[PDB]
Amino acid sequence: MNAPDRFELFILPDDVPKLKITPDSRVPNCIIIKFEREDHTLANLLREELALYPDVTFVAYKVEHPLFANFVMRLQTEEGTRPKQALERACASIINKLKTLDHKFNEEWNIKNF
């Protein structure tokens, strides 16, 4: 009756970017990234790998409200180092970690009999 169409949990709607980046005025060298059609699955994963670049001064993320599949990510880094980059890096480090995983799980598998 009033509930959306299921496919609104992953498909971007009419003119909408996965990412929208806004500068934060509250404190220097800081930004808030709006991720559209996403959740903890991807949020928390990005949040995590950023407290890894000890070059990142801050990193938390949140889901405004459960009805809407979106989420905000706030990042702040050291002097003259752009966070967007740290987002790239920490994001890449993620794929590699998984790239390795995929592989280590495939050779491993083949060695099975059952």
Chain residues that interact with another protein, rule: CB under 8 A: 6-7, 9-11, 17-19, 21, 35, 38, 40-42, 44-49, 84, 87-88, 91-92, 94-109, 111-112, 114
Nearest to another protein of 26, 41 (CB atom): 41
Strands (E), 1-114: 19-23, 30-36, 56-62, 70-77
Nearest to another protein of 50, 57 (CB atom): 50
In sequence order, the 6+-apart residues with CB closer than 8 A to the CB of 9 are: 37, 69
**Minimum distance of another protein from residue 82's CB (angstroms):** 11
